[PDB]
Enzyme design. Structure first.
Site, PDB file in Angstrom:
ATOM      1  N   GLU A  35     -21.626  -7.421  -0.992  1.00  0.00           N
ATOM      2  CA  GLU A  35     -20.704  -6.800  -0.081  1.00  0.00           C
ATOM      3  C   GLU A  35     -21.425  -5.686   0.648  1.00  0.00           C
ATOM      4  OE1 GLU A  35     -17.725  -7.382   1.279  1.00  0.00           O
ATOM      5  OE2 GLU A  35     -16.953  -8.987  -0.013  1.00  0.00           O
ATOM      6  N   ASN A  46     -12.459  -5.306  10.094  1.00  0.00           N
ATOM      7  CA  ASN A  46     -12.040  -6.693   9.897  1.00  0.00           C
ATOM      8  C   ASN A  46     -11.444  -7.108  11.212  1.00  0.00           C
ATOM      9  OD1 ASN A  46     -11.861  -7.515   6.736  1.00  0.00           O
ATOM     10  ND2 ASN A  46     -10.856  -5.526   6.856  1.00  0.00           N
ATOM     11  N   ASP A  48      -8.917  -9.041  11.712  1.00  0.00           N
ATOM     12  CA  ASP A  48      -7.445  -9.200  11.774  1.00  0.00           C
ATOM     13  C   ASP A  48      -6.749  -7.871  12.050  1.00  0.00           C
ATOM     14  OD1 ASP A  48      -7.885  -7.984   9.280  1.00  0.00           O
ATOM     15  OD2 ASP A  48      -6.301  -9.131   8.291  1.00  0.00           O
ATOM     16  N   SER A  50      -7.718  -4.977   9.875  1.00  0.00           N
ATOM     17  CA  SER A  50      -7.864  -4.005   8.806  1.00  0.00           C
ATOM     18  C   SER A  50      -9.307  -3.567   8.690  1.00  0.00           C
ATOM     19  CB  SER A  50      -7.363  -4.604   7.542  1.00  0.00           C
ATOM     20  OG  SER A  50      -8.215  -5.633   7.149  1.00  0.00           O
ATOM     21  N   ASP A  52     -12.661  -2.711   5.902  1.00  0.00           N
ATOM     22  CA  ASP A  52     -13.272  -2.756   4.608  1.00  0.00           C
ATOM     23  C   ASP A  52     -13.961  -1.448   4.258  1.00  0.00           C
ATOM     24  OD1 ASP A  52     -12.286  -5.211   4.551  1.00  0.00           O
ATOM     25  OD2 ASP A  52     -14.165  -6.180   5.167  1.00  0.00           O
ATOM     26  N   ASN A  59     -10.718  -3.989   1.141  1.00  0.00           N
ATOM     27  CA  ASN A  59     -10.033  -4.130   2.433  1.00  0.00           C
ATOM     28  C   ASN A  59      -8.739  -3.388   2.544  1.00  0.00           C
ATOM     29  OD1 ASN A  59      -8.603  -4.750   4.645  1.00  0.00           O
ATOM     30  ND2 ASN A  59      -8.744  -6.965   4.374  1.00  0.00           N
ATOM     31  N   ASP A 101      -4.268  -8.378 -10.262  1.00  0.00           N
ATOM     32  CA  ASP A 101      -3.236  -9.295  -9.710  1.00  0.00           C
ATOM     33  C   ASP A 101      -3.548 -10.772 -10.009  1.00  0.00           C
ATOM     34  OD1 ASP A 101      -0.837  -8.002  -8.914  1.00  0.00           O
ATOM     35  OD2 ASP A 101      -1.543  -7.611  -6.853  1.00  0.00           O
TER      36      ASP A 101
END
Length: 129
Positions: A35, A46, A48, A50, A52, A59, A101
């Site tokens: 990363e 990002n 879309d 957002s 990172d 993110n 999660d």
């Protein structure tokens, strides 16, 4: 913080990621390098909308508040820049949560296809923990 091979993982093990949800520490020492290549400050846009953040490239799209994001969730309930701090417990402690999660480490693209299928021990070999 410029993180070295030896330095990042000695802390990710004292950061409580060693075999966390079974993922061996080398997954943590490899994925950190794919990363951000051990860069704690690197933050990327990002597409879309957002961003990172954090050495674990966490993110901001729902994990943190960066304040430039409509549709952000902050489950980790921390401001996005904390992830940038020289302390790994900022990043590592919501890293657990991301595995917390149950969606694996498949959250990350760099482990996803560039860090899997390999010798795990090879990042941690010759470095004492």
């Amino acid at each position: 913080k410029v993180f070295g091979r030896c330095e990042l993982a000695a802390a990710m093990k004292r950061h409580g990621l060693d075999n966390y949800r079974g993922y061996s520490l080398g997954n943590w020492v490899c994925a950190a390098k794919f990363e951000s290549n051990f860069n704690t400050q690197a933050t990327n846009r990002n597409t879309d909308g957002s961003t990172d953040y954090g050495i674990l490239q966490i993110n901001s799209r729902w994990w943190c508040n960066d304040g430039r994001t409509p549709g952000s969730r902050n489950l980790c309930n921390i401001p996005c820049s904390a992830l940038l701090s020289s302390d790994i417990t900022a990043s590592v402690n919501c890293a657990k949560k991301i595995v917390s999660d149950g969606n694996g480490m498949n959250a990350w693209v760099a482990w996803r296809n560039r860090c899997k299928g390999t010798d795990v021990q090879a990042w941690i070999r010759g470095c004492r923990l």
